[PDB]
Write a protein that binds this ligand. Structure first.
Ligand code: ADP
Length: 311
């Protein structure tokens, strides 16, 4: 089983193909998946259960998506459950199905139907703190038993799933660290105080790892700018057009595409606005043509484009 073996030993490397930085997080996730596959954990539990803490737009969903791609062959294998829409008493019915004799009994639960049709999946519970107290109890059952009973009586198997829960609760103390000067490993033990105020020990002790994501450096955003324009590069390659960006041009997109609150979330449409918009203009005008090497630098208005003609 060398194929799987090699994927498991080199899981960090595989995940770093798409996820920039967050070294500790990827190590935490890979280590746990390795424990499960080595046969060192309870086989009546999901492969791994994780709590992702830190700011927004820094790699939480990215890692969930990448994990689904390398572990279960596709990004489509990640199931997203947003806990913002599970805040009322009606939430239990949306998650596992309305009880027999109720209006929404036929369609079943959002979580249960998704895992029933895709047992080999990464399940992402975003904003776990916003969830209804009763939804938690179902999630605890699932983390303990590796299974769940829906409103039809059908037992849904979760043993082949990875569970990722995300929270902003860690953010304020993490954003202070290590800005003040806290060590690279004391970040997990310090944030444990905020977690106890919101989560009971039954929950926290059943987690494989509590994972801390940090804000990104300038080099890392630059690397994400490079990944984010892979599709554009490949699209231009069909026309034999290449795109050469100066460090200044990479920095320009990095600064406008990143903010301390939304993280790297605005980046894609910044690239769309600052790069793809004027480039499309240059293609339509006939300045950029089939087979051109296109250089991109910074100007007074934005990004500037040049073709080294007859040199
Ligand atoms: N560490 C990272 N590695 C690769 N891409 C990232 C990283 N952080 C953010 N991104 C990019 O920024 C966008 C938002 O990141 P995401 O992980 O979805 O944030 P969140 O998990 O807070 O929703 C994604 O489109 C992703 O491509």
């Amino acid at each position: 089983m060398l194929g799987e073996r090699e994927k498991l030993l080199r899981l960090e490397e595989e995940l770093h193909k798409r996820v920039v930085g967050q070294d500790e997080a990827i190590r935490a996730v890979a280590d746990a998946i390795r424990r499960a596959r080595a046969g060192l954990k309870d086989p009546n539990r999901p492969i791994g259960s994780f709590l992702f803490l830190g700011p927004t737009g820094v790699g939480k969903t990215e890692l969930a998506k990448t994990l689904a791609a390398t572990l279960f062959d596709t990004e489509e294998a990640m199931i997203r459950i947003d806990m913002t829409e599970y805040m009322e008493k009606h939430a239990v019915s949306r998650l596992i199905g309305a009880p027999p004799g109720y209006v929404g009994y036929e369609e079943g639960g959002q979580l249960t139907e998704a895992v029933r049709r895709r047992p080999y999946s990464v399940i992402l519970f975003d904003a776990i703190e916003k969830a209804h107290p009763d939804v938690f109890n179902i999630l605890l059952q699932m983390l303990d038993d590796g299974r769940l009973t829906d409103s039809h009586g059908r037992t849904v198997d979760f043993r082949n799933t990875v569970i990722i829960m995300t929270s902003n609760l860690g953010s304020p103390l993490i954003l202070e660290g290590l800005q003040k000067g806290w060590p690279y490993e004391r970040i997990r033990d310090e944030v444990f105080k905020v977690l106890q105020q919101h989560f009971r020990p039954e929950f926290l002790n059943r987690l494989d790892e509590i994972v801390v994501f940090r804000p990104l450096t300038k080099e890392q955003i630059r690397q994400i700018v490079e990944i984010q324009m892979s599709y554009l590069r490949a699209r231009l390659a069909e026309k034999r057009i290449s795109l050469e960006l100066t460090e200044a041009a990479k920095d320009f997109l990095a600064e406008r595409g990143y903010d301390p609150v939304f993280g790297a979330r605005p980046l894609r449409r910044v690239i769309q606005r600052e790069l793809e918009t004027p480039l499309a203009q240059k293609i339509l005008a006939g300045e950029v043509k089939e087979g051109d090497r296109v250089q991109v630098d910074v100007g007074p208005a934005g990004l500037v484009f040049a073709v080294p003609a007859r040199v």
